[PDB]
């Protein structure tokens, strides 16, 4: 189906404790495949998935230099935002970036991204047109004016329409065994009495890839969104993900509840119930 490539950058200042640490990690869909950490004893771009290991020395050398220079750029940016937001040298601050592209089944560009945050809040983002910017505030507008003057968006567009899609296509082919395999959820419902009058029904989904999934409870065929406890989808550590959804039901009314599961790996949505 459709696929994504994403690079996630995190730079964090630590006044009194050296220079800001830089981390870059790369993903295809929900699979991480590269990392770089400036705090590593010997910082280097390193493989984190089997299908990227075949990339030659030039790949690792270039990406390492790129992350080394990026480390310095984010340190400059952290100093800059202290000025733009009139902040002291005392506090720790964070810059984040998300960059990448989505492609469809045929590998054509669906859209590109280049967006930044400061201390967890939107700072500046490339719009979907890949030609204009959204600045969150008057500080980010200073960056926007600077980036407009230098025609940064044009260069972003070039990367996103070329390099980004080209390499995503390559990774998808080289990792087709895993990147192009959906693992459906293994499902079951558990039942736990809470008291003489109430019981918990918990609907489980395990071992699925990718992470996107829909898990819902219905009572007499009606969605129980408000009364459902839904945990965040979580990694199992073996590439797969897990999720559950729980409802508190009146004792004796268990069979009026149905769990519904949708996932890319399922030909048709699943309906399941408590089965004693």
């Amino acid at each position: 189906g459709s696929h994504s490539m994403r690079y996630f950058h995190t730079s964090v200042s630590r006044p009194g404790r050296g220079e800001p640490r830089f981390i870059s990690v790369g993903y295809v869909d929900d699979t991480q495949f590269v990392r770089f950490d400036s705090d590593a004893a010997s910082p280097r771009t390193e493989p984190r998935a089997p299908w990227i290991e075949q990339e030659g020395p030039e790949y690792w050398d270039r990406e390492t230099q790129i992350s080394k220079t990026n480390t310095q750029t984010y340190r400059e940016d952290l100093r800059t935002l202290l000025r733009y937001y009139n902040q002291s040298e005392a506090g720790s601050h964070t810059i984040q970036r998300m960059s990448g592209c989505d492609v469809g089944p045929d590998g054509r560009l669906l859209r590109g991204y280049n967006q930044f945050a400061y201390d967890g809040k939107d700072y500046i983002a490339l719009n979907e047109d890949l030609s204009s910017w959204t600045a969150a505030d008057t500080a980010a507008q200073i960056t926007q004016r600077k980036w407009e003057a230098a025609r940064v968006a044009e260069q972003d567009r070039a990367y996103l329409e070329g390099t980004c899609v080209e390499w995503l296509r390559r990774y998808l082919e080289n990792g087709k065994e895993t990147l192009q395999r959906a693992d459906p959820p293994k499902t079951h419902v558990t039942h736990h009495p809470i008291s003489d009058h109430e019981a918990t029904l918990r609907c489980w989904a395990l071992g699925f890839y990718p992470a996107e999934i829909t898990l819902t409870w219905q009572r007499d065929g009606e969605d129980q969104t408000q009364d459902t406890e839904l945990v965040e989808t979580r990694p199992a550590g073996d590439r797969t993900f897990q999720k559950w959804a729980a409802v508190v039901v009146p004792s004796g009314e268990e069979q009026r509840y149905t769990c519904h599961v949708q996932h890319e790996g399922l030909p048709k949505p699943l309906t399941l119930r408590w089965e004693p």
């Binding site: 690079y7 870059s24 790369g26 790949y59 990406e63 790129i66 220079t69 990026n70 750029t73 984010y74 400059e76 940016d77 800059t80 935002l81 733009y84 960059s99 960056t143 600077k146 980036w147 230098a150 940064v152 260069q155 972003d156 990367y159 390099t163 980004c164 390499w167």
Partner: peptide, 9 residues
């Protein structure tokens, strides 16, 4: 593959 940052803030 990721490229250099294009320009500082």
């Amino acid at each position: 593959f990721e490229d250099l940052r294009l320009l500082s803030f």
